[PDB]
Structures are given as structure tokens and as C-alpha cells.
Design a protein around this ligand. Structure first.
Ligand code: DTP
Ligand code: DTP
Ligand code: MG
Ligand code: MG
Ligand code: MG
Ligand code: MG
Lengths: 496, 496
RNA sequence: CAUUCUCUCAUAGGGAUAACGGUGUGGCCUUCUACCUGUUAUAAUGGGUCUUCAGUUGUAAUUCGUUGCAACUGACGGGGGGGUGGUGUCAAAGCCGUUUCAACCAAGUGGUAACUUACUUUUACUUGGGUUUAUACCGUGGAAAAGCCUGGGCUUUUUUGUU
RNA sequence: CAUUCUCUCAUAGGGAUAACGGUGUGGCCUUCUACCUGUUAUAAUGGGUCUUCAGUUGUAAUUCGUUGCAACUGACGGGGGGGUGGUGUCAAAGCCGUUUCAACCAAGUGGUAACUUACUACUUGGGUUUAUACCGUGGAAAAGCCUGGGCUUUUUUGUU
DNA sequence: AAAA
DNA sequence: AAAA
């Protein structure tokens, strides 16, 4: 019957997706193990395949078991739903690390219950997304974080003095009152069928306050919870952009922003979600770099991996530190770490001006940021010689960055760190009894690294060119002007 | 070539759609001719197949010719586009009747140019719809008039006294300055590639002011033109809803609505689209039925076939008159009009309490409003006995009507008109020499028509039941609750 | 000037091809209808019944938000013109009847009929999806007849292929 | 406790099952290119070159928005510590060099190392099959334990 | 998920 | 197209 077929399809698709993910995981683990043995030699550890721990907690957690008998599970689920007796099995909750705020309580529901929640979340979103505020970029399938950043950037660039108000909700998911939620079902012209309402209440039955964490239906519940707040902020005339609990409000008038503060306070008192004074920065005044300000002032704001100023959009400083950590660790892992072991048995010592480890490190760096694109391909796309270019790297997560200066500094940092890591590798090789300072990768000065590396050619391709952020940024700008926000983050589903 | 394949696909799809429409048209004409001959007897006119006149104006207008050689057309179009020399051919402009405002000039572009406009409109909308205001419901794949009506109804029901202003632009499409349009291309973070910009300018080259009327790129340009107006209205805090030129702005404060008037005036002065004094009602005050008012007051407002009051949503009076005209003409055509001819040769005369013409008229009426649904099916859906119901009738164009009293009056009108038309048919039959007043369809009183017609059964089905608006309205409400607005009018596209 | 296939100097021009595309009805599969009752060895099949909403009562749960069940009550087919009765008041209005006229707009017009391949125009749609017997459509093929020009061509009917 | 197929009392329980699912590389088709130069009867293949942005100049169209073309100019790889020189000043700051240290965080810490299956969102344009090879389960061999057949560990084969 |  |  209709519901049972839908549940069958959803459960089968979810189980097959999980199985494909596991197979990719173990295949790439084997491949990386082969590469690691080619890297550390005799000191390389053995391949270790981890099945997820909770698969042993219950059979329905296992994708393989669910795929084994999914028709029976779907039949039983449909029968229980039609009898109004269905209740999701309790999830496996683990302490996901949140050192910024202590610890966070995540939950992994069983595959059938997670599939049911996903299906009903899809239905509810489909029939109700026209009622959600257009500034609700939280989750959804029509709104992205990048749309919010574009909106904020354009509006900030329009004027010169803006009043900000950044607020976070302390444990937003875990402190939603159930009375408020049940009162919200008959408001704003929401269309929730009795089956969907019963399912929603079923997912809230175990707890007495707040919505479960880590399941799809909670996303729709969170979006629906902040509808009166969104309407009030809109009718105040302030501009805002909410993403889950993270909210940023900016207006040109102090009175409007004070009223927005009062509105959020009233909404919190109505729904029981208090604001943590720590993460909430309060009311500020976003000016230009050197404009005098009469109240508390800041020259830039941070919003979901972007540091937004009046003039330009730039990568968040913490995200820049993450990028630096990843690149530096790639260099250390492929250049220095193998040489710090007790023995170098089974390792290929660079010779004849052929350091394969340097080539591997450069290729992996290019994969990290470009995604494997050569400079020739990017330049061809920029010139218009070609029309196809795929964007999947660290930059595809920040398509709207227009801060060329920050990317210039990042490129300089990359070159300098490459030079210093090469110097350390040469020193370690000398300490190990190999003089290689006159060979190709080590004899290069910092100034001449980029030029000589670009000139270098292997197998008819330039695999040694040092990747640059500015080039991929130019490609990103052209791709935005020809494809659109959707295409840039098309593969990269902003799940953060 | 990527562009040429896209153009080929679009042109082929458009031509095939037009060919399918034509074949449906002539098959339907033949079937209706057979039925008409079975109705009018020897006085029935002969079948007349009309190919559209403009197909002879140029071969590219003909879907058959385009489908003949579409690869060549697409190749030439792509070559001309990439040479920046492409220019759409002159459309066929005809005087579509607009007696409300005199006449209107619509344009039918050639199939290749129309296909190119549709393709580039799809692209531009896809990469820019996230910048359009959520309150613009015209020419979108995510918005439609019913979302606007739902929003207006909910907001009106929230309060009791609302200040609203209604404005129509005198000639929205034909009086848009091209300087303003070309200035709008670099605003609001719009992503328009140089190719799309060139195409847009190509479609505007023939005229010196205003956008064409009959293409899709004109629809996108109309949406893009009113972006500053939408942003200004949103920043004022007024809640508005725009559908093409028809704009409705309602707020709880007089000052906000006066500022909205000033904003629209400034936008008109900036874009050259002067408002229409006759069509624009100006600033009013929407109260309840008997609440005293201090300024010009109205109890209900009209917006795209809906008459919206504070309490309930009802069909527009002109649309109700259209429904009455259609139903009454169905009755007159199947009952009275054949009997007004000079001779009754070849016409079946009712006998043995079997009026096939009455059955045909009732079935056609049911097709008009229900779409062919029996009362049993609708009652089964309402009870929950069944889960599948299809909504395609006159009611599917007004899914949000919650005025049960108006539908009750319409049902009474239907029954009374059926009774009176049957009486006239009996009188005409008597005048023609046939006494049938004692037979089934005519002996019925007005009170007993519905009951006995429901009891009547032919071929194991109740094809004689008089259709009722209230039942299909209940089905519409349940369908809105279960499936949502998009699915209810999914087949019944109410766009324009 | 095949609406089919193909070629190219490719939004145009050649070639050969007689099918190309589409409709109503029916069969098969696939869901999708509670109950009652016809006919057969228990399944087809035929004839019927009900489904909704609101309130109250009682009842069973509820994680107390809410929900199910049972019984009653109520709602569930317009308006206008004319005649007339009862009720209502001091007299009315009003309310409740009953009779008569009508295709609708028209509860209207200075006036009142027509129309659906219509009308205007924000304005307008037809059966749940595939699978093939018979019916049959647009245009193009051919076979016949006719009526014109020329001495083969044009036009009109019929037939056949698509079928 | 096949992750395969099938049955049902169907979010659980049976049956037989030897394949099931997936990865890297290659081939093939189909696109995503300009230019110069190697080799062959004119096409493959090998090796190189450039592509961007802004301004100015002049030119050609423009439906006056703008666009094209040509030539120049300019931009196009961070920061910190130490030494040192020149410039700058009344003296400085500052600016311009040059030299040296460092894997990154670190322009930092009370202190400086480690780490990627980590910590707290991604890996090559899409299908099509030679060889490589993975998870889990069957098999066949060996071994090491219990029992007198079972358990555990390795090797081989089917997927392949 | 609209032009024409 | 949307989370564990
Ligand atoms: N990566 C994540 N994926 C999904 N949900 C997340 C993630 N991180 C946090 N959440 C949850 C926790 C919150 O309910 C909400 C995001 O809020 P967050 O900014 O983490 O602060 P918080 O609500 O935990 O506040 P506090 O730390 O003060 O309790 O979604
Ligand atoms: N049926 C239609 N199809 C396409 N465009 C239309 C249609 N009707 C109107 N338009 C155009 C005209 C306007 O620019 C806009 C809609 O305007 P509309 O509300 O019909 O009034 P209008 O602006 O034409 O007033 P007027 O009749 O006085 O000229 O789209
Ligand atoms: Mg928070
Ligand atoms: Mg108008
Ligand atoms: Mg009348
Ligand atoms: Mg350091």
C-alpha cells in the first residue's frame, strides 16, 4: 500500500547509502595503507578496519541487517503507524566533542526510525517551506549558508554604518517547550496532516522538553519553532539572517535593533530557550576601518566560516587556522614525519633530484584546495578557452570570498612553509647520513620555489606547480557569474 | 558544443509540445463534432479544422517545420549567439481583447526565438531566484498566486483593522526604461553572465522603451525590475504581496502605508511605470462587517480571482459570474439550444423517462466543477476509506476558498437553474408536439430534484447526482491538509 | 513544398521514402472502497447501504499536549418579482407558511436575447500509470472516380497504408 | 548468525545459497580548448608557449547602455625574531635594502611539541570492460587449542 | 511549475 | 538537497 511502499523505498535507499559509504571507507583505508607502507617502510602500522561500535548495539543499526530484511521492517512500521502505536526505539547517544562549550549530546537513531523521520521531514518541508521566512537558511533544501552570506555582504556594502545584534541560544534544541510546539501546529497556515502530527509527537514522547538531536524531524521542528520570531523581526523592518540558533540582525537604526533585542527576549521567554551571554555578542556598531563610533564598535563580524566586514568578505580566522593546520600537516606527514622514525628501512631516500615525497605532498595539497585542477585548466577556464570546470576543494566551501589580500597572504604562507619544511627535510636527511642540499627540491631559494616548480614537468604534465589561492579565487568568481551559487556548492552540500 | 545541444533540446521539446497540442486539438474537435451531430441532428455544422494563422506568416512559426529541421536552426542560432550577432526575428503581434482597458498587444515570437528566451529565462531564474523577494508570486517555479492568497488571508485573520493600498501600473511591460533595466544588472548581487546579458539586450533591441510581451525573458526582467521596490517595502515593515503589476500592501499603521505609497511613487518615477489611477483603489481600511471606520472603508478586497475579507476567503464575484455563465451555458446547450432550431430532424426525443441530453448535461457539469468525480469517491476520501483523490475542476483553481456560505448559495443556484432549464425544455417539447411533463426529468419539483437524481442509477453508477460545491470544498480542505497547496493545483496550473 | 529518414554550402537548400504523430472505447497488469445482499462451486458477479463537520454525554488511554470508542443533539442545495394566509404591533416593519413566472448574466438594464473551435485575459483544466483487439483523426503518400485547363496538369469526392 | 535469493506467524523467525557489494589503474565512446615545434604518410605523437584583472591611448560598431580590436602602463606568492647597511631627521619614527633561524598553530604561550581511520562539511566528465585488489560469508589447505568432532590463527581459491 |  |  502507499505508505508501506514509501517506507520500503526510503529504508532501502538509506541502507544502501550507508553500505556504499562503508565500502568506500574500507577500500580507501586499504589504499591509504598501501601508500603508508610505501611511505614509512617497515615502521608502517597494519591495516585496521573499524566497524562502527553501535552496529553491535542493535541489529537495526547495522545497514547490512536492515538491507537483509527491509520489507519486514517497513511492513511492521506501517502497521504500527496506522495503529497509532508506533514508537521509535531509543537512539545511541554519544558525547560528541564540544570543547568550546564543554560537551554536546548527539544521538544516532536506528536506521528504520531515522528513515521514517527523514521521510516525514521531507513531506513536512515540501508542503510547508513556502511559509518559512526567506531569511531562514537553517537546514532546508532551498536555502544555503552561502545565500545568507551573500545577503549580508550586499546589505553591509550598501551602507557604511550598521547596528548588529548577534545572539545564540543556549542549548537551542534541548530546551524547546513541548506545549509551545504543540501550540505552533495550528498557526501561520501550516499544513500538518494527522499522520505527520502523530509522528512528530511520537518522536517527542521519550523526553519532556526539547527536541531530539541528530534526526531529520528536529530540523523541521526547529525551523517551525522560530516562525513568530521571524515574522516579528520582518515586521520590525530589520534585516536578519537566522541559521539554526545562530542569529544576526542588522539595521540602520538603533531603535529597530533595540526592538529586535526585545523581540528575541520575548520569544525566548515564550519558548523557554534562553540566550547564553558568552556566545551572544550583544548589540554592536559595524563601521568602516577608521570611522569613529559612539557606542561599542567592531570592524568585522563572523558568521559561519566567513568574516564579514563592510567592504569585503573573508574567511573566518579560525577557518584560516584550520586551513593552515591541514596544509602544514600534509607537508609534515609527507616530508618530515617519516624521517623522525627510529629507522629509515623501507623508505625511499630522495636522490638524482627526484624527491617523490615532495611530489606526493604537493599533489595532496593541490587535491586539498584545488581538488586536482592544474593551473592550465584554471587559466583555460578563465580565458574562456574552456567551459567546464569543477569546483571541489577547500575553496568550494567559501565561494563568496572576495578578499584578495587574505588569499595573497595565504599563498605567501604556503610558499614560506613549503620552503621551511624542505629545509627541515634536508637537515634531517643530513642528520641521517644523506647530503642532498644541492639537489632539486632543497637547493631552491624561497623566491625561486614557485618559478622552478612551475617550470618542472613530469609525464607531460606540471605536477610540481605550487597551488595558489588567487587563481582558484578568480575561477570561483567567474563560476559564480556563469553558473550561480547553486552550482558552486552543488556537490558540497553545506552540512558544516 | 554545450550550448548547441541545449538549444537543440529546448527547441525540440517546444516543437513537440506544440505538435502534441495541435493533435489533441483536432482529435478533440472531431470527437466533439461527432457528439454535436448526435445532438443537433441534421442541423449540425461540418467539422472545421483551423491551423493557426501565423503558421503561414513564416515557416519557423510552424511547429512541424521546426521539428523538420531543428538541428540546423539550433546550429545557426548557436553560431550567431557566439558571434554576438544573434537577433530574434519579428514576432506576430495581435490585438488580444482587453475591454476592461481597451485593447492589449500580445506578441507571439517565432519558435526558435521563444525557445531561446525560455532557456535563458530558466537559467537566469535558477541562478537568481534566491535574490527575489519571497513576496513576489509571479513567473516563478517556487511561487504562485495561492501562496500569496494564503499569506494575505492569514495576516488578515490575525488582526481586525488593516490599512491596505492597491496599485496597478498603467502599462507595466511596455513602459520600462531601458537605462534603468541596464543599471539593475549590477545590483542586489544578481549573477548574470555576459552571454545572458547580451541575450537580454538582444531581446530589447527592437524597441526603445519597455520589455516585450509574450516571451519568458520578459517575465524575468519584470521580476528583476521590482527588486528595489520590494526591498524598500520590506524595510518599511509593511507586509505586501506583488503579482506582476498587481500589488497589494497591507499594514497595521497608517504611517507605514503612506510611506509605502511614497515608495511606490518614487519607484515609478525611477522606472517610468506610472500607476493606473482607474485600476488602483488607493489607500483604504479593511475592517470587519460592521466596525465603524474613520477613513474610506471596505469590508473585502479582490486579488487574483479571490475576494478576501477579514474572516474568510471567497471567490471573486466576477469569477462567480464566469462559473454561472459556464454552467448555465452547458445547460442551455445540452437542453434548450437544440430545441430552438428550425427542425428537430435527427435529434433524439426524450421518451420512457430517459432524457439522454439531461444525462449529458449533468455529466458535463460534473466534469466542469468536479472533473468527473462521483460523490461516492469524494465521500470515501473524506471518510479516510481511500487515500487517492484527484482535484481537476473549477474548484481546483480556488483551493483556498473557505467561504462555505458562498458555495451553499452556488449550489442552490445550480439546483434552481437546473429546474428552470428543465421546465423550459418541457415547454419547448410541448410546443414541438411532445408531452413529457409526466416523465422522469420534468415531473420533478425543485425540492425533489437532488434526492431523486441521487437515487437514480445507470450502469451501476450514479451519473445523475447533481454536483455540489460543498462536498468538493470539504475534499479540497482535506487535500490541503494532507498534500499541500502545490499538489492540489499541481495538474490545475492556475498561473494566469 | 511528408509533420518520416538522410545530406549540406545549415533559423536555408537538396535527396529518397509512405508511413509519421495523435484520439475515444475495450482487454491485461498494477494499486484504491466499509458494510449488506443476489449466482456458482469458496470466488467471481449483480443490486443496495453509509462515510462529513460541530457540540454534549459516557467510556478507554495519554507523556495530560491529546486521542480513540460508544450514544444523542445540531448543521449539511441561492436569490428575485407577483398573489395569498397566519403570526407580530395601536398601526407597521419583521417572521413563518402556501401559490405562480424564469435557461444564465438579471439582487440587473434604457432595453433582452445569443453564444463554447465562443468569450475575455490577470481568467483559465479533464479521469491512476503502463500494456494491445476493434473505432477513428491532422498532414503526406498512393487506387479510383468526377469537374476545369492543356492536349499532361489543376480542383473536388471515394478508397487504401498509418490501421 | 552470507551483506545473496526465498518463505512467513514479519522492525522477528526459518530455509537453501557461493557468490554479494565496492576500490585504484588501463582500454573504448562521448565531450572541455588556443598556439608553436619534433615523426610518418596528411594524421597521430612528443616537447614547449600564452590565457587573468584595472587604467590610458587610438580605432570599428552600438539602439549610446556598452562592446570589439590594437598598443602601452600597472597589479598578480604572508608575517615574525636576530645582525647589518643606505636613506630620513636637530635626534627619531619611518622607508629601502642585505644577512641569518624556524615544519604549522606561533603576529603566540607560563612552555613547545605532537597528530589525519586524527581533531572539530570534498575529491577528478559520464557511461562502457583487460589486468590489480578490498569488507563480510563460503570453500580447500596447513598450523595452534578443546573434545575425541568442535574452537582459534595463517595460506590458497570463487567475487576475480 | 505557464506563454503565445 | 540537505546529518551522523
Ligand atoms: N555540528 C552540528 N550538527 C548538528 N547540530 C549541531 C551541531 N553543533 C551544534 N548543534 C546543535 C546544538 C544546538 O542545539 C544547535 C546549535 O547551537 P550551538 O551554536 O552549538 O550552541 P548551543 O545551542 O549548544 O548552546 P550552548 O553551548 O550554550 O548550550 O544545534
Ligand atoms: N494575459 C496576459 N499575458 C501576458 N502578459 C499580460 C497579460 N495580461 C496582462 N499582461 C501584461 C500587461 C502588464 O504589463 C502586466 C499585467 O498588467 P494588467 O494587470 O493586465 O494591467 P495592465 O498593466 O495591462 O493595464 P492596462 O490594461 O490599463 O494597460 O502583464
Ligand atoms: Mg545558541
Ligand atoms: Mg498595472
Ligand atoms: Mg430573470
Ligand atoms: Mg615559530
Amino acid at each position: 500500500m502507499k505508505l508501506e511502499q514509501q517506507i520500503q523505498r526510503v529504508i532501502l535507499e538509506e541502507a544502501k547509502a550507508l553500505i556504499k559509504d562503508y565500502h568506500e571507507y574500507h577500500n580507501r583505508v586499504h589504499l591509504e595503507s598501501v601508500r603508508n607502507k610505501k611511505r614509512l617502510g617497515d615502521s608502517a602500522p597494519d591495516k585496521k578496519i573499524h566497524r562502527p561500535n553501535y552496529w553491535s548495539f542493535d541489529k537495526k543499526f547495522d545497514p547490512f541487517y536492515v538491507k537483509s530484511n527491509y520489507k519486514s521492517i517497513a511492513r511492521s512500521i506501517a502497521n504500527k503507524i496506522e495503529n497509532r502505536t508506533y514508537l521509535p526505539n531509543e537512539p545511541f547517544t554519544k558525547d560528541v566533542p564540544k570543547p568550546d562549550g564543554g560537551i554536546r549530546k548527539v544521538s544516532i537513531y536506528q536506521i528504520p526510525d531515522a528513515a521514517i523521520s527523514k521521510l516525514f521531514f521531507n513531506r513536512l518541508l515540501a508542503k510547508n517551506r513556502h511559509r518559512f521566512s526567506s531569511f531562514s537558511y537553517a537546514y532546508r533544501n532551498d536555502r544555503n549558508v552561502h545565500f545568507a552570506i551573500q545577503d549580508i555582504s550586499v546589505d553591509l556594502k550598501k551602507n557604511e554604518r550598521t547596528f548588529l545584534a548577534e545572539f545564540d541560544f543556549s542549548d537551542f534544541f534541548g530546551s524547546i517547550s513541548h506545549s509551545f510546539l504543540n501550540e505552533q501546529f495550528n498557526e501561520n497556515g501550516f499544513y500538518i496532516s494527522p499522520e505527520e502530527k502523530f509522528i512528530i509527537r511520537s518522536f517527542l514522547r521519550e523526553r519532556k522538553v526539547g527536541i531530539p538531536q541528530g534526526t531529520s524531524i528536529s530540523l523541521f521542528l526547529a525551523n517551525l519553532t522560530c516562525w513568530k520570531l521571524d515574522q516579528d523581526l520582518e515586521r520590525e523592518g530589520v534585516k536578519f539572517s537566522r541559521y539554526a540558533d545562530d542569529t544576526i540582525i542588522w539595521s540602520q537604526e538603533y531603535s529597530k535593533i533595540c526592538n529586535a533585542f526585545n523581540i528575541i527576549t520575548n520569544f525566548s521567554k515564550s519558548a523557554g530557550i534562553k540566550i547564553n551571554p558568552k556566545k551572544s555578542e550583544g548589540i554592536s556598531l559595524l563601521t568602516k576601518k577608521g570611522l569613529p563610533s559612539e557606542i561599542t564598535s567592531k570592524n568585522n563580524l563572523d558568521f559561519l566560516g566567513y568574516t564579514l566586514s563592510v567592504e569585503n568578505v573573508s574567511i573566518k580566522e579560525k577557518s584560516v587556522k584550520k586551513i593552515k593546520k591541514q596544509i602544514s600537516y600534509i607537508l609534515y606527514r609527507n616530508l618530515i614525519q617519516p624521517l623522525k622514525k627510529t629507522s629509515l628501512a623501507g623508505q625511499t631516500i630522495p636522490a638524482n633530484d627526484r624527491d617523490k615525497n615532495f611530489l606526493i605532498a604537493i599533489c595532496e595539497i593541490r587535491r586539498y584546495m584545488y581538488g586536482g585542477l592544474s593551473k592550465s585548466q584554471i587559466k583555460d577556464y578563465l580565458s574562456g578557452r574552456s567551459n567546464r570546470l569543477y569546483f571541489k576543494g577547500i575553496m568550494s566551501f567559501y565561494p563568496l570570498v572576495n578578499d584578495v589580500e587574505q588569499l595573497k597572504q595565504l599563498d605567501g604562507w604556503i610558499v614560506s612553509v613549503i620552503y621551511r619544511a624542505l629545509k627541515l627535510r634536508c637537515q634531517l636527511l643530513s642528520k641521517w647520513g644523506y647530503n642532498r642540499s644541492h639537489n632539486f627540491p632543497f637547493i631552491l631559494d624561497r623566491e625561486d620555489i614557485v618559478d622552478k616548480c612551475s617550470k618542472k614537468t613530469i609525464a607531460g604534465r606540471k605536477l610540481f606547480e605550487i597551488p595558489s589561492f588567487l587563481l582558484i579565487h578568480k575561477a570561483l568568481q567567474k563560476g559564480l557569474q556563469e553558473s550561480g551559487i547553486e552550482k558552486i556548492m552543488n556537490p558540497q552540500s553545506l552540512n558544516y
